[PDB]
Ligand binder design. Sequence first.
Ligand code: SAM
Ligand code: 7PK
Ligand code: SF4
Ligand code: SF4
Length: 300
Amino acid sequence: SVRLADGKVRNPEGIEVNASLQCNMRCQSCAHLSPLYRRENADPAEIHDTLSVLARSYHASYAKIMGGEPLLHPDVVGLIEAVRATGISDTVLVATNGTLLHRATERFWQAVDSLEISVYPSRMIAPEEIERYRVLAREHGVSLLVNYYGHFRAVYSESGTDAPDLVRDVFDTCKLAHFWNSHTVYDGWLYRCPQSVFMPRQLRDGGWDPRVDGLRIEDDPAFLERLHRFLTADDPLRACRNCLGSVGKLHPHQELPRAGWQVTEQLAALVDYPFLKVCKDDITADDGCVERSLSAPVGG
Ligand SMILES: C[S@@+](CC[C@H](N)C(=O)[O-])C[C@H]1O[C@@H](n2cnc3c(N)ncnc32)[C@H](O)[C@@H]1O
Ligand SMILES: CN[C@@H]1[C@H](O)[C@H](NC)[C@@H](O)[C@@H](O[C@@H]2O[C@H](C)C[C@H](O)C2=O)[C@H]1O
Ligand code: SF4
Ligand code: SF4
């Protein structure tokens, strides 16, 4: 999966760059807890500097420009170009809820390699508009993927678990840690997953410093094997104790517009235990969240 080659850690999936921590939706069980985050747009110069350092010892297939909703970013193309210019990835992908996609310029389509549109019931996108986006993508040689979500799985609780057996099983079947390789860059540090950096400070008792679970991005000679150890380590993070990994219980997707988004239910009551047993046998088991999907790939 994640392997060394030509003096770099290779991620066959993506390095995740959260353009905006905030969002324009309030999805229940949002894995980045974006409904709880204030306006915070990444600085392209800062992102370029950090990723240029990491790029000397790390390379991923794509850089996933995301966040909450990256189309909220005032200069998403400047961020794309900064990420591309680091050489940290072969391609640059933007993942978006689509609601703001009408605002995107031609300048945006010219700078993007791939586009992923999550389509949720509460913010449904008209097939005529998705058709137009398919035409636009083909026009600019952009790969397009449109996911129609039926469900989400719970992701965390402020009321974490004390049983190491549960934490271990949650971490062991976590697709973010082991399969999707949701490597996340934030404020100069690298994380195994978005939950480990964005959840702890949202635990209303204050949580803890997320840097306990991350790795400071540096480029001394000793960094390469440090990165190698960090990204293949097989022990649960501290954030796993409050996390449901990929085995939280399934619920019909919906927004929670009213205040009180935080989850306080006992973690163990939120675990999908039959699905955990399934993911123990096969960590790639479909999570049941996408009901229909459409892809218009551009063949390399
Ligand atoms: C955190 S979102 C951010 C990017 C963009 N705003 C979006 O939603 O597509 C990244 C991906 O994770 C998915 N996701 C977030 N929370 C999830 C959950 N609790 N269960 C299943 N998928 C989830 C979203 O559908 C999306 O494809
Ligand atoms: C079936 N749905 C999946 C699927 O499309 C994956 N395909 C490789 C993709 O990896 C998606 O994104 C991840 O979602 C996590 C919950 C948060 C993380 O930040 C992230 O990127 C998405 O959730
Ligand atoms: S659209 Fe939903 S899943 Fe995506 S960042 Fe916003 S609240 Fe989270
Ligand atoms: S905190 Fe742990 S269980 Fe949660 S997403 Fe990260 S590695 Fe997976």
